[PDB]
Design a protein around this ligand. Structure first.
Ligand SMILES: CCCCCCCCCCCCC/C=C/[C@H](O)[C@H](N)CO
Lengths: 235, 285, 238, 60, 238
């Protein structure tokens, strides 16, 4: 009976950084939406983290956000020949702030916003954010409408008001064209989990509600009293 | 400062917090080791369950008031103790052989009964614990089973993908929506298949939520004393469902030729310690 | 200043780490604490709650609800085996989508004693005895009751009590058996046989339905952590 | 309840105070004070109709 | 020397930090301290000073000074609503350029009790009663006095006292409501209705002008910081 559980705790089950978003943004003139890359902060994009959160109804944690920003070189002509290091800027936007329309905008100063400048060839950039919500818990399921007359959106997409992370390059790149990809990682710590609930049997299809297709319970075996194999797979 | 502790194998570790924020420290990851029947009289309407039957007290906790220690309201008008505590009886659903299942949505299922739909129609906020008691009259030659479960925040998926759901199809006014043993083909209705329980989870895995069994052999009724579970302490009852009952028969009822075939099922909920806040002269509808 | 030396392990991003980091919202007070009921502490408390296991998991039955109801027909059989399954809590079709299995599937190694409680959903007047036997890996699955009797077993009187429970014991060469059990670190077969034959009176229906609930006993443990091979995705779903 | 031992059922007996109109459907009766009686679990369920009245004494 | 390891977060320029740095003017003495009056400590002390709110903010009126003066004509009305506005201190046109709003617009979240003090600028002999009612979000705006009476209200006798003050209470589902209020985390409507009708004697002009002052009560708080969406620029202005 001296086999107690340490790696089954609520911390070690949830203190592992999972990838949440995959962005892509170039560094050239023309098509200004390709220069920056916006993302409203969900946890519902990637599945590998979503199933771990949707075992509990409510949560409350502090987080550790990290970014592995890597870049390539775009094909074609007029390439760099030689290229200094290129730095990236990650800006958080709170709910209700002014967003930049494009790159080199007026609003990229970020006096109040917690921007962070990161150089390539270094360690991945890291920050900590506390339990930030108006409510007392990050509710993973909200069985209720938005308006009191029962219209509007339905589901968890009413208390997910966490603003956006808008990333951009801060070099002009006079000669060449080069994309970069952003990979956001969430590692929640000091986690508390309330009201457990079953895992999702059906596959995920949306990031707005709990839509699903009716799937089978388990896989099929041969008979009611099938014991599998009596000897190995040979002969 | 200068702390020393133990690690999971003398051996120690000295970690200091170098930052002025509580959410900037590392993760903790360390532990410091003719017959007698009971009769619930609530309000002015009693029940009679059994002497031998267990009563499931929610998620461990009894339903209680919201004290001044954890209130965020401005002014707190009165809560009634007799006017809204009665054992209100809803409509009687009828159990047949091939009956799939039934569900309810209780903050929007008591809007017509008594003053519970006459207090929450005026006040903005709301908070109440519930004392569900579901019963079916048994006999010794009427084999069959039942499962009740009060799932909290039972977000239900729509029948057709890239659609929302409609309030007419999610809840009903006095009736319990059936649980098609097959798949609904609707364009705006709910995906009401019975082997996925609406939410998409496995229907065998509904036993985490407070649950009780109404096995016709050894039980006549079932009583779940559910507590108020919500993140925010107070939220309006017309745009939020606190939980959801689900009565799913796992074993179908099989009578004989000379036996009764109209076995009913009733639900007799009763709100415990119902509090209200924010009186606005509204009269919602 | 201080002449440090950068060891190997510098400028890396090991995922399962525990490092400090500066705060992005400095001096940000939080909402005060509330007592929501059901504050779970360890994940294994979900694997102590019973979840029905789909024992009749046949191909036609799995899609239907009738995969959880195991048939116990009344008559003179005395040879029929109501059910049999290898007790592999991780790979076996019977236990994998059950709550015990889903938490277990997250963790690579499993050590403990599983408990199967078989409820009888049947007429009050019905009476019968069933022998449920955990046969350890030994040699070959039990095929007749005399073979099952030798292995650890419980005789359950359906009439005297519904819900007889078998705590399958932990007998194993190694402290931990991998969830993806191989021939080595595998587990023994579990089977149920008629002892007297169900005796149902004229007024009640002869057929009855028995269901199986599976939850780990108190002494259960997990050892590693890994991706669940049950859920997947293709693109960034929007 | 004078009935076979095997019979089982539940009945809601509700004293509706004078208020407005007699209960005509179960949902109307549920609001007023009531007791759910399981015929199978116990015969002889008893309802003590409460004394709620404007005056101390009501004329026969 | 000391074998340190560079954690993630090295060679970065997080703006809202607090780090030390070497001095560019070493051993540079300063001018000694002087006591200029009005040394403010917290920014919210500017949001405790009343600033007139442009209640009559109609399209023609906003350009003119006559956007701060609310009309209170004398006669038999008993149905006319002098004013009504959603009590959204951040987005609402009425309160956004007022001092409370300008400090609030800098901060993302608002929690507290606003106070509106309505002064009466009118002849000494004038006498009347007005009901100012904060109706909580509930259902629909008050449209007749009987609808307004139910919600919290104050009857003000213009003759007995000028400057009646209404401290709009904080009744909300959440501790903090976002300055950019949505249907969720919104605030209730505020309205004013005639109770008796202004009675002005022959020697005084019938019309009178009432103005509105808005300042937060002592218990007001802000939670986040963000760009003000009120001022902008195009180039480096020279
Ligand atoms: C360093 C710059 C970026 C800073 C980003 C701000 C912090 C990130 C937001 C925290 C996310 C909270 C956890 C999940 C919130 C919601 O409850 C879930 N999405 C539920 O859908």
């Amino acid at each position: 009976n001296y086999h107690s559980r340490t790696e089954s705790s609520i911390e070690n089950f949830l203190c592992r950084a999972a990838c949440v978003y995959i962005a892509t943004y170039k560094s050239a003139g023309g098509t200004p939406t390709e220069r920056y890359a916006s993302w409203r902060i969900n946890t519902r994009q990637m599945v590998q983290l979503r199933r771990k959160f949707e075992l509990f109804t409510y949560l409350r944690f502090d987080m550790e956000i990290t970014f592995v920003i890597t870049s390539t070189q775009d094909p074609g002509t007029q390439l760099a020949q030689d290229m200094p290091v290129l730095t990236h800027q990650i800006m958080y936007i709170p709910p209700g702030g002014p967003v930049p329309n494009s790159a080199t905008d007026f609003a990229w100063q970020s006096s109040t916003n917690p921007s962070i400048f990161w150089t390539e060839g270094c360690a991945p950039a890291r920050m900590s954010v506390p339990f930030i919500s108006i409510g007392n818990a990050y509710s993973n399921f909200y069985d209720g409408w938005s308006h009191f007359t029962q219209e509007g959106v339905y589901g968890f997409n009413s208390l997910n008001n966490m603003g956006h992370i808008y990333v951009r390059h801060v070099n002009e790149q006079s000669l060449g064209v080069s994309t970069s990809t952003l990979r956001v990682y969430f590692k929640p710590k000091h986690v508390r989990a309330w009201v457990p609930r079953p895992p999702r049997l059906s596959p995920y299809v949306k990031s707005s509600n709990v839509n699903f297709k009716p799937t089978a319970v388990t896989t099929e075996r041969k008979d009611i009293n099938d014991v599998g194999t009596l000897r190995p797979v040979g002969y | 400062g200068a702390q020393v502790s133990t690690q999971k194998t003398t051996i120690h570790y000295t970690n200091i917090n170098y930052y002025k924020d509580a959410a900037s420290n590392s993760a903790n990851r360390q532990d410091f080791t003719s017959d007698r029947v009971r009769s619930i009289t609530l309000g002015n309407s009693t029940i009679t369950t059994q002497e031998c039957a267990n009563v499931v007290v929610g998620y461990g906790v009894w339903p209680s008031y919201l004290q001044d220690n954890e209130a965020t309201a401005e002014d707190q008008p009165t809560q009634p103790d007799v006017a809204t505590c009665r054992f209100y009886t809803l409509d009687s659903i009828q159990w047949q052989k091939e009956s799939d299942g039934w569900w309810w949505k209780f903050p929007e299922a008591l809007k017509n009964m008594g003053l519970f739909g006459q207090n929450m129609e005026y006040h903005y906020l709301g908070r109440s614990g519930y004392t569900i008691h579901v019963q079916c009259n048994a006999s010794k030659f009427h084999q069959g089973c039942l499962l009740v479960v009060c799932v909290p925040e039972a977000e239900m998926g729509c029948s057709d993908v890239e659609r929302e759901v409609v309030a007419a199809s999610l809840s009903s006014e006095d009736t319990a929506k059936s649980f098609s043993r097959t798949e609904s083909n609707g364009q705006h209705t709910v995906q009401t298949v019975v082997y996925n329980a609406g939410m998409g989870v496995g229907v065998g895995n509904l036993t985490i939520f407070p649950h009780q069994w109404i096995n016709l052999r050894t039980n006549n009724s079932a009583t779940i004393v559910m507590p108020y579970i919500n993140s925010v302490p107070m939220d309006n009852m017309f745009r939020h469902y606190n939980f959801t009952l689900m009565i799913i028969p796992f074993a179908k009822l099989e009578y004989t030729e000379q036996a009764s075939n109209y076995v009913p099922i009733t639900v007799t909920v009763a709100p415990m310690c119902a509090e209200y806040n924010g009186l606005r002269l509204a009269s919602h509808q | 200043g201080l002449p440090t030396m950068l060891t190997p392990g510098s400028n890396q991003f090991l995922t399962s780490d525990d490092f400090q980091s500066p705060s992005a919202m400095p001096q940000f007070d939080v909402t005060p604490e509330m007592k929501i009921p059901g504050e779970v502490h360890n994940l294994m408390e979900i694997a102590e709650v019973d979840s029905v296991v789909p024992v009749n998991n046949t191909k036609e039955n799995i899609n239907s609800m009738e995969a959880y109801r195991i048939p116990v027909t009344g008559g003179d059989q005395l040879h029929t085996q109501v059910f049999g399954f290898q007790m592999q809590p991780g790979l076996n079709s019977v236990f994998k989508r059950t709550l015990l299995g889903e938490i277990l599937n997250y963790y690579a190694h499993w050590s403990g004693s599983v408990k199967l409680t078989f409820v009888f959903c049947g007429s009050a007047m019905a009476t019968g005895k069933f022998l449920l036997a955990y046969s350890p890996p030994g040699a070959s699955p039990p095929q007749n009751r005399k073979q099952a009797m030798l292995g650890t077993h419980v005789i359950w009187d359906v009439g005297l009590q519904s819900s007889c429970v078998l705590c399958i014991p932990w007998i194993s060469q190694t402290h931990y058996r991998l969830v993806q059990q191989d021939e080595y670190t595998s587990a023994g077969y579990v089977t149920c046989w008629y002892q007297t034959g169900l005796i149902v009176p004229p007024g009640a229906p002869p057929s009855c339905t028995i269901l199986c609930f599976a939850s780990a006993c108190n002494d259960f443990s997990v050892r590693n952590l890994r991706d669940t091979p049950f859920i997947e995705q293709t693109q960034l779903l929007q």
